[model samples]
Target chain A: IGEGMLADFVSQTSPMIPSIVVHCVNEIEQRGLTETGLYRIDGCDRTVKELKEKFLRVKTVPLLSKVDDIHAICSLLKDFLRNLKEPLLTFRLNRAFMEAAEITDEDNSIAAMYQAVGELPQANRDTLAFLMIHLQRVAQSPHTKMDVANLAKVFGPTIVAHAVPNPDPVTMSQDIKRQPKVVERLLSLPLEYWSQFMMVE
Target chain B: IGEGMLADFVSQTSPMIPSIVVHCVNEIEQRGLTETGLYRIDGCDRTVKELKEKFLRVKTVPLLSKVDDIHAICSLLKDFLRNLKEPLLTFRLNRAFMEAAEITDEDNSIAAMYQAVGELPQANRDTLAFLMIHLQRVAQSPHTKMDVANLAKVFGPTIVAHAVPNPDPVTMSQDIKRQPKVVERLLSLPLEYWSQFMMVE
Candidate 1:
């Protein structure tokens, strides 16, 4: 509920991914896969805020059915990712991930990115791997118009924060351009690659 | 465009009303009257903010067709009302409007309220009058589930403001309770009554 570290939200049972994350993705897949411009457009701000507070107050996944706006749920999910105490792709390894994206050979670039993914803390690793697959599923629907590349563009900066807290505009813009590449490359890899990091057996 | 005094948005033509207000109302009536929550639900905050900025920058009625969410338009309309340099019913006459609602004789109550309406400056009176009629039309649709009383409650404090800069809690709460009554009584009057106040000849 609260925008705390991902470690705090790890589920107690197997597949120890954050329940809130699962709930959001599940709701979207269940009702919103065909929704055009899903994550590209932001949801109602007041509705998203109220839902966040409601989640915190009720202390469990409240009835999402009560929320008529699917976009609000999508916004809430992205909001959770953005406000994380640490980005899913960790600041320490973000530059490495970006460099991995820039490697000339496609296979070598993915291999380098995978190497960096391996270094992420367990909770961050599990969430990132779990989320990439979710993004993949969201992309499968033609109506979404959000293939891996587009999804990467939408989620890139959100998934990876700047290694330098305050980079100059030139550095930030250049870094931003490279951010989506990491996700696009990761998602381009076979699904089997990400399944390894999911907490479930 | 800017959230300035109502006097500034006065249209050049016969109706002499703010085009923004007309645009919001027209958009709603054209497509949103039957939307169950209509004015009751808040719109997407980000969309509303963007739309407000768009309106300010464009300095003309922008194409509302791009906005898919009707509630956003409704919220924008209300935002325009709330941010006016003064409330639609002048802060000076707000207490009078509230007191008029408290009159025990129903006829006398409405009569007193109309007297206060007459005192509002030209722009304020015209816009308030125009808005009340729009609310009445919105209430006519059973699907909206918002009658005069409900609309009044939803918009009461929004249309009226505190006469004393900062009233005590007990006084404020009591005043808040009566605020809707003023609106309810006004809407209960025949539509012909409000037409007299509209800027149109």
Candidate 2:
């Protein structure tokens, strides 16, 4: 929830930049968030104001960081999602995306995926597409400890609960995280690839 | 582990010559346990007899009755599978079963499913089939304190690990539990339906 994580999320390959402190540049954005000002989106629970304030402190000096919880940022995303008003990005895309993950033919797979997301509600669909791009940032570094499986473990249940409607979430998330590399490939593509599905046609 | 809990798993429809709990049935067919002595299975980390003794008190006299740590007959099954010495029923039937849970086409899906299981290693496949009929006995009354979903939740991962092979299992099992209901329908139909696939051709 912290805009500060955006600092962390940003360094993927910023556009044209000059006149910036090399060390701090990666740590500073325009003092804004790409998807901040919390509007209603899938899995968003709190008001923008509440998330905003908490995030302000959370990012600045995580009130709970040193606490025993060691709340992995990965695990916290679920509450963020469970709290959201919409169902889930994964549920919204449904079978198209699920089958797409296994398609051996690359073009066919992406085509099927695009067709699937074209059906999601605007708010969730766009947010999902945006988040897909952002999550890719982790892939860019390849050096970080993060990987798709862990991320999937944290998000798969909330992400793919249409069948369940609800339950076994922790179990479900963990189950999905271990799927073959194809599954991760499905989730980690670039913004350009995912963007075509951005429209809610 | 605890044979005493057999009372709980048995009453499915035991009222006849056929349903008679054949005390002399040992030599009638195979020589084995309806539910064997405690043994290890996937999630099992403890010794079989060790856990069996616990279940003895947990389910017996307290027998399927309320004794703390409800790990009674429930956790006992993991060992049931673990002791089987088969690769895995779920993993053996593997991908075919995974996609079978999602099959949309009529002719194609079942054909694909049959073809998939058609090639399984003998031991695990036949055990899975036998277990299917054996597991079906629990449906005696349908007056269960349980329903298909949670059963699917509990047994599903063990049943479908072949394709997935890891993580998000709780979620994937849940995903299959709600799948078109046919997945259960497939598992629930007469032993007749399962036999056709049993040819192992």
Candidate 3:
């Protein structure tokens, strides 16, 4: 978002450096630019001077800058996905199933299940894996479901039942608490973490 | 997000590799996460396996994966910003001013100004700087006292006048055009791409 209006508000609300404000205005002037355009704006001697001053006191500037980088990546990914044909369809179908399952758990008052899927990041691995597997399953179902609504009916209740919490609250929380430690162990030191498990190869 | 529902869905959906789904679901579920939880769901894994799988298949997965890493770093930066006080306040206040300026421009019937700041990203930076300089200038004005409303009035027109078309178009389609270019540049020449104009010394 542009900071011109914001700078104005801040200027009226409190004291601020004019150069900083002007620099921000210049940036707003160059929004919707390509990397080349952005580079040009960045190279502008006047704009650079103000930005330097703004950056001087900003402790989290590096972090903020990284946020820009992430957003750029997200944009790229979105673009990449948009160009696909069948895979885009797969994404939509899987997302629908995932959403349907989430909804079913919520309707059934399955708090634990609801919380788990609801809290998942849009970009989480488990989420994608679930989507892939769910889509594959949907393809195999004998029902010949043509739409998300129909698929929802068949799988929704099943998911709710599985997600429903057991009677023991203390045990549930305890189990939940151990999850992070386990993940840390698994990802950080995969071999050592999985070696003790019976399934480990 | 918790993985029980996803696990249940995966287990039911994919008969051939139920084990992989079950394994991943269990790993994610152990953390008691919903979709948004970071503890269990790593962003990198999800992007590679799910969202970008189609594109990655066409391109190279490893290259896309590195792009995902850059995005992750940015996400981390945004998360870090949430904990800070002044920067957050600055961000919020700046947004408010931008809104006010937009309103003022619209009311004045200044189509040029309206269109200028109207360019999504460009407008944002312009408005911010305009308000900053205007407010600072007004605050220093001997005849009139500076206030939020007065500052809005003073800077609103300036923002509209100076606002340029966003060098970048706000459209998703426009952003999509540059996606491969960014990914290609980053993948082929990492340092040259990133180090063009160092924002910091």
Candidate 4:
């Protein structure tokens, strides 16, 4: 940007094309969806206005005050990610992370997942950790400050869905019926060793 | 649970009151919106079945997906999260976080806001962090990661409208003709350094 410009635009780096933010936000503020075909174009019922109400009234504080609301915003966040001039993760890398699930041994697969983060720009990396830290802190669960389960819960869908062009098609049916086996396993293992506890034959 | 005994009359607890989920998801599967009063009851055009179909055929693959489709499912996920026995964060504390915005000190207020995270149940706290990570991560840009500004784009109405219930009955008509001064102050803060960034702003 310093290379050359109309010169009047010299202060144009850091957060470039900045004014557009206000112009666009104003569009959301003034526009109504049923009458205007913006957010409604997506076959959903929510007005972009309604979702905004949720965010401002419910989401802006306590970090994660509303899970459902937070999730709504996260989902919308992905829509915005598409607009960036550079892909959030290079398209090649984003694909690798999403496909890492295809790899079997959980530990080895985890490394490849880590490598995706290992490759981001400094700003992206710090922000990723910063964001992850908050949830990991939540996962602290009186047990430990960090929990992979917490990470999995938040980023799992995100990592898999991040760059993908597909909607998740697998049977969420089994998922709903399925209990968290590891959590149960942790509860049960001590009993397995407790002789008096008796393993059911 | 596996204890048997026909466990037949059957029983449940916690995430156990499970029937409502399927009983409803099935409704989404079998029903239509127009003649019946489901999605349309909520003032929407689609049905549970139609939304599920998107999940089945469209969502499962990575192979540029539909934005509205993702948004639709995101809205449904909000419905699902409500079933959890735990209040991702307790309501009392959530309120405290929102109220912190009233504190004007940028430095102290941030510390106070950060403290809200420090105080949550480990599980709730981590999930909050987990959720925020995805958004902050996108702030990456030369292009960015989950840009908050991008988030503002999606949630323009929500942040500005948080605490505001119902359609903003204010100035949709006076509208863009009268612009906001803060909009300019905001324009200059490209680094996003505008004190609060107005959590709900």
Judge the docking of candidate 4 as incorrect, acceptable, medium or high: incorrect
- For all predicted structures, in order, the TM-scores are 0.48, 0.30, 0.16, 0.25
> Pick by TM-score: which candidate is best?
1
Model 2, total clashes: 25
- Can you write out model 3's per-residue Cα lDDT over A76-119, one digit (the tens) per residue? 22222222222222322333223332333232222222223223
Model 2 segments beyond 4 Å from truth?
A1-75, A90-93, A167-185, A195-201, B1-201
Quality of candidate 4 docking, DockQ? 0.01
Q: Tell me model 2's lDDT, rounded to 2 decimals.
A: 0.40
iRMSD, model 3, in Å: 22.4
Superposed model 4: Cα runs more than 4 Å off = A1-201, B1-68, B79-88, B138-146, B149-201
Positional deviation of residue B167's Cα in model 2 after best superposition, in angstroms: 55
For model 1, the superposed segments whose C-alpha errors exceed 4 Å read: A1-201, B11-14, B164-171
Compute the DockQ of candidate 3.
0.01
lDDT of 2 by residue, B1-201 (tens): 113222232332422111111221211112222323211112233533445555443543223232222233334444444332222444435555657556787434443444454455544445455555544543332433334444454555444433333438686656455433333534543443344333423
lDDT by residue (tens digit), candidate 4, A82-172: 3443343443455554444334655434334433444455434333333333333334444333354533543433322233343255533
Q: What is the TM-score of chain A alone in each candidate?
A: 0.90, 0.50, 0.20, 0.37
Compose the digit string of candidate 1's lDDT tens values, residues A83-193: 877777877888888887788876556545655665677778777777878888888987888788888888887888677656799988988888888888878755655
DockQ of 2: 0.01
Quick one: best lDDT, which candidate?
1
